[PDB]
Design a protein around this motif. Structure first.
Motif, PDB file in Angstrom:
ATOM      1  N   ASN A 196       0.845  -1.190   0.000  1.00  0.00           N
ATOM      2  CA  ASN A 196       0.000   0.000   0.000  1.00  0.00           C
ATOM      3  C   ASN A 196       0.885   1.247   0.000  1.00  0.00           C
ATOM      4  O   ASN A 196       2.104   1.193   0.199  1.00  0.00           O
ATOM      5  CB  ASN A 196      -1.084  -0.044   1.094  1.00  0.00           C
ATOM      6  CG  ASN A 196      -0.581   0.231   2.488  1.00  0.00           C
ATOM      7  OD1 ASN A 196       0.573   0.609   2.703  1.00  0.00           O
ATOM      8  ND2 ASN A 196      -1.474   0.043   3.464  1.00  0.00           N
ATOM      9  N   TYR A 227      -3.090   0.582  -3.495  1.00  0.00           N
ATOM     10  CA  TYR A 227      -2.577  -0.757  -3.280  1.00  0.00           C
ATOM     11  C   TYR A 227      -1.946  -1.228  -4.568  1.00  0.00           C
ATOM     12  O   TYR A 227      -2.246  -0.729  -5.654  1.00  0.00           O
ATOM     13  CB  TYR A 227      -3.704  -1.730  -2.891  1.00  0.00           C
ATOM     14  CG  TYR A 227      -4.438  -1.284  -1.653  1.00  0.00           C
ATOM     15  CD1 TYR A 227      -5.546  -0.445  -1.729  1.00  0.00           C
ATOM     16  CD2 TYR A 227      -3.997  -1.665  -0.401  1.00  0.00           C
ATOM     17  CE1 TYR A 227      -6.187  -0.006  -0.593  1.00  0.00           C
ATOM     18  CE2 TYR A 227      -4.632  -1.238   0.735  1.00  0.00           C
ATOM     19  CZ  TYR A 227      -5.726  -0.406   0.641  1.00  0.00           C
ATOM     20  OH  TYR A 227      -6.375   0.024   1.782  1.00  0.00           O
ATOM     21  N   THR A 229       4.154   0.875   2.371  1.00  0.00           N
ATOM     22  CA  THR A 229       4.405  -0.234   3.277  1.00  0.00           C
ATOM     23  C   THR A 229       4.067  -1.539   2.543  1.00  0.00           C
ATOM     24  O   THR A 229       3.420  -1.539   1.488  1.00  0.00           O
ATOM     25  CB  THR A 229       3.544  -0.218   4.550  1.00  0.00           C
ATOM     26  OG1 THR A 229       2.208  -0.662   4.257  1.00  0.00           O
ATOM     27  CG2 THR A 229       3.440   1.175   5.138  1.00  0.00           C
ATOM     28  N   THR A 230       4.451  -2.665   3.149  1.00  0.00           N
ATOM     29  CA  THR A 230       4.053  -3.988   2.689  1.00  0.00           C
ATOM     30  C   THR A 230       3.485  -4.789   3.853  1.00  0.00           C
ATOM     31  O   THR A 230       3.828  -4.563   5.015  1.00  0.00           O
ATOM     32  CB  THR A 230       5.219  -4.772   2.068  1.00  0.00           C
ATOM     33  OG1 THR A 230       6.334  -4.766   2.964  1.00  0.00           O
ATOM     34  CG2 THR A 230       5.638  -4.137   0.757  1.00  0.00           C
ATOM     35  N   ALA A 231       2.614  -5.738   3.526  1.00  0.00           N
ATOM     36  CA  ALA A 231       2.031  -6.638   4.507  1.00  0.00           C
ATOM     37  C   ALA A 231       1.549  -7.871   3.761  1.00  0.00           C
ATOM     38  O   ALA A 231       1.270  -7.825   2.565  1.00  0.00           O
ATOM     39  CB  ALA A 231       0.860  -5.979   5.237  1.00  0.00           C
ATOM     40  N   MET A 260      -3.243  -7.179   4.674  1.00  0.00           N
ATOM     41  CA  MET A 260      -3.651  -6.066   3.829  1.00  0.00           C
ATOM     42  C   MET A 260      -5.128  -5.966   3.632  1.00  0.00           C
ATOM     43  O   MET A 260      -5.678  -4.860   3.645  1.00  0.00           O
ATOM     44  CB  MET A 260      -2.872  -6.077   2.523  1.00  0.00           C
ATOM     45  CG  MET A 260      -2.785  -4.728   1.819  1.00  0.00           C
ATOM     46  SD  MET A 260      -2.189  -3.317   2.712  1.00  0.00           S
ATOM     47  CE  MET A 260      -0.378  -3.611   2.322  1.00  0.00           C
ATOM     48  N   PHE A 281      -6.474  -4.308   6.510  1.00  0.00           N
ATOM     49  CA  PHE A 281      -6.192  -2.886   6.600  1.00  0.00           C
ATOM     50  C   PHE A 281      -7.087  -2.099   5.652  1.00  0.00           C
ATOM     51  O   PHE A 281      -7.531  -0.998   5.984  1.00  0.00           O
ATOM     52  CB  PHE A 281      -4.719  -2.600   6.296  1.00  0.00           C
ATOM     53  CG  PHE A 281      -3.758  -3.129   7.334  1.00  0.00           C
ATOM     54  CD1 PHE A 281      -3.961  -2.930   8.683  1.00  0.00           C
ATOM     55  CD2 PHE A 281      -2.629  -3.826   6.935  1.00  0.00           C
ATOM     56  CE1 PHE A 281      -3.054  -3.413   9.600  1.00  0.00           C
ATOM     57  CE2 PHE A 281      -1.738  -4.319   7.855  1.00  0.00           C
ATOM     58  CZ  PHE A 281      -1.948  -4.114   9.177  1.00  0.00           C
ATOM     59  N   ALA A 282      -7.355  -2.647   4.466  1.00  0.00           N
ATOM     60  CA  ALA A 282      -8.246  -1.987   3.514  1.00  0.00           C
ATOM     61  C   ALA A 282      -9.680  -1.955   4.029  1.00  0.00           C
ATOM     62  O   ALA A 282     -10.389  -0.970   3.819  1.00  0.00           O
ATOM     63  CB  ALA A 282      -8.184  -2.717   2.164  1.00  0.00           C
TER      64      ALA A 282
END
Ligand SMILES: *Cc1cc2c(cc1C)nc1c(=O)[nH]c(=O)nc-1n2C[C@H](O)[C@H](O)[C@H](O)COP(=O)(O)OP(=O)(O)OC[C@H]1O[C@@H](n2cnc3c(N)ncnc32)[C@H](O)[C@@H]1O
Ligand SMILES: *[C@@H]1O[C@H](CO)[C@@H](O[C@@H]2O[C@H](CO)[C@@H](O)[C@H](O)[C@H]2NC(C)=O)[C@H](O)[C@H]1NC(C)=O
Ligand SMILES: *[C@@H]1O[C@H](CO)[C@@H](O)[C@H](O)[C@H]1NC(C)=O
Ligand SMILES: *[C@@H]1O[C@H](CO)[C@@H](O)[C@H](O)[C@H]1NC(C)=O
Ligand SMILES: *[C@@H]1O[C@H](CO)[C@@H](O)[C@H](O)[C@H]1NC(C)=O
Length: 475
Positions: A217, A264, A292-294, A299, A302-303
């Motif tokens: 993201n 994203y 950032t990355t996840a 993710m 988070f979205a």
């Protein structure tokens, strides 16, 4: 009410799951998410099985009342409660079966499911995804019948067009399966206007196994810039999005809350940096970014916070939404983008309302859509534009001039589109409750509307499912 009560009391529906206005829980069961509305059903029932759905429908037919299925309750017009007063509301909450066919990679969920529980089940059991709206507790039936748009839609499509088939109960209790190759007229209208034709009991969606375990993201902040600089930035973002961006990006550009964006990327995380460099190329020298990355499922959460939770992230709200789409062939111009920003966010000034809105980048696989294949018109959509007013904290009365204030700020944009010869077009799930039939019908369905009315006459001739103000009329 006596007729409807007596008919329902002779079905197997539990008395505790049959509610009229004398019920102790009437206010709770009828409470709308969209607090600007308060539709008053004839009754609310909770069927436990398909036969009870049919029994409730038969009682509505015998009593001469309309029928509205209630799923997640998210309608921006309280349509699940009927929109208009007096419907029998069939609350589908028990219909949450989840099964997966590993031979075809198809996920089947019940017609009363919500985004988060179903997405969580599919992820935890099979490591798979389907495009979905960006909110944990929205109904999957109510959102899939109005297209839907999610963070993965530029490469996977919409919730709607990822449906492979649905099982539907028609007004007479007959159950059919609808798909592109079975009862195609019913599938056509499910894909854009389902509430007007039947009760969806089950839905089967295509699914995707993510290629990469990690997703990215990002944010973009232009800093303190003038209107012409912000508008030029949007034009430059648009050019990148239409010529260079891969389909695996998502991007949201703030309308309220300018000048900022976020998004994203679902391609290889090691390819992001070069792609993000190309996007920020023309942006003004005050611009800063973050990345950032996840892992994929982190993710997703988070979205859409609390996808795997137990309660709605978004409490009931008194608001008024407007929304338009632009297509690839006639996207923003400097003049239309400026008209939008100048008279919506840059002129907004209220003590009793707050502003909300954004531009969601579309494009991508909307290039594969044909408007003749389903009721909803959305071929080659390029941008989804949302402009919304929300009642201020601590107030309970929507202001009498709130709709007019919100519409006036969005009007210069419309006039510039008209000046440029760009059709006014909408997005079904983003219902604008103030539009006339002449407006919503063509904005949502283009020239499919006459076909939809014919199908209405054929599949619901008595109008059992004619409920809310944007219901499809018979021909
Ligand atoms: C509240 C909200 C809505 C929302 C959103 C976030 C929030 C907090 N985010 C969205 C997003 O990212 N993308 C998008 O496309 N839409 C988004 N929305 C809007 C939402 O999708 C729509 O409001 C949707 O219609 C809500 O569906 P839900 O199922 O939650 O609501 P409902 O009032 O109960 O029903 C809506 C209509 O659908 C018909 N319906 C429901 N179930 C059935 C079945 N089983 N069969 C046939 N029709 C059904 C209802 O009758 C009603 O007309
Ligand atoms: C982008 O991804 C990051 C994770 O890399 C998310 O960061 C979390 O943000 C929440 C905000 O409520 C914080 O409370 C957490 O501390 C953050 N987690 C971590 C591990 O840093 C961020 O929310 C994501 N943003 C979007 C828009 O998806
Ligand atoms: C939801 O999923 C995220 C991502 O795996 C995880 O961090 C979080 O603990 C989960 N929440 C619950 C309540 O299980
Ligand atoms: C915003 O509205 C107030 C009245 O509520 C007014 O006094 C103020 O000048 C306005 N701000 C502008 C027009 O920039
Ligand atoms: C129920 O209505 C549907 C839709 O009009 C129709 O196709 C079907 O034949 C009807 N079923 C009967 C009459 O048993």
């Amino acid at each position: 009410s006596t007729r409807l009560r007596d008919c329902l009391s002779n079905t197997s529906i539990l008395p505790s799951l049959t509610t009229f206005s004398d019920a102790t829980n009437w206010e709770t069961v009828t409470s709308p998410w969209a607090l600007r509305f308060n539709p008053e059903p004839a009754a609310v029932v909770v069927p436990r099985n398909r036969d009870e759905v049919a029994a409730a429908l038969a009682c509505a037919v015998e009593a001469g009342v309309k029928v509205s299925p209630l799923n997640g309750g998210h309608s921006y017009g309280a349509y699940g409660l009927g929109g208009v007063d007096g419907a029998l509301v069939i609350n589908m909450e028990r219909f949450t079966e989840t099964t997966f066919d590993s031979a075809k990679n198809l996920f089947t969920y019940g017609g009363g499911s919500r985004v988060g529980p179903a997405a969580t089940w599919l992820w935890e059991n099979h490591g798979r995804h389907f495009p979905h709206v960006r909110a944990n507790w929205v109904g999957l039936s109510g959102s899939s019948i109005g297209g839907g748009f999610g963070t993965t839609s530029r490469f996977l499509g919409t919730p709607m067009d990822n449906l492979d088939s649905v099982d539907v109960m028609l007004y007479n209790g007959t159950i059919v399966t609808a798909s592109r190759t079975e009862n195609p007229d019913l599938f056509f209208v499910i894909q854009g206007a389902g509430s007007s034709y039947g009760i969806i009991l089950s839905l089967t969606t295509r699914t995707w196994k993510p290629e990469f375990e990690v997703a990215t993201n990002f944010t973009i902040s232009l800093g303190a810039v003038d209107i012409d600089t912000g508008v030029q930035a949007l034009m430059d973002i648009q050019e990148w999005a239409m010529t260079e961006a891969p389909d695996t990006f998502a991007l949201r550009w703030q309308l309220a809350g300018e000048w900022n964006g976020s998004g994203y990327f679902y391609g290889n995380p090691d390819e992001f940096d070069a792609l993000f460099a190309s996007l920020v190329e023309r942006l003004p020298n005050t611009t800063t970014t973050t990345k950032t990355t996840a892992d994929f499922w982190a993710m997703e959460n988070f979205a859409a916070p609390l996808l795997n939770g137990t309660a709605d992230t978004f409490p009931p709200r008194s608001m008024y939404l407007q929304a338009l789409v632009l297509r690839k062939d006639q996207p923003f111009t400097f003049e239309s983008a400026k008209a939008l920003y100048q008279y919506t966010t840059l002129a907004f000034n209220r003590t009793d309302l707050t502003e909300f809105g954004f531009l969601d980048l579309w494009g991508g696989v909307s290039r594969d859509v044909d408007d003749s294949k389903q009721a909803m018109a959305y071929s080659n959509n390029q941008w989804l534009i949302r402009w919304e007013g929300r009642l201020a904290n601590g107030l309970t009365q929507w202001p009498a001039d709130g709709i007019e204030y919100m519409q006036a700020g969005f009007r210069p944009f419309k006039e510039q589109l008209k000046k440029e010869g760009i059709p006014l077009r909408g997005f079904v799930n983003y219902r604008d409750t103030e539009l006339s039939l002449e407006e919503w019908s063509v904005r949502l369905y283009g020239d499919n509307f006459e076909k939809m009315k014919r199908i209405k006459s054929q599949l619901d001739p008595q109008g059992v499912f004619t409920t809310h103000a944007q219901s499809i009329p018979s021909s």
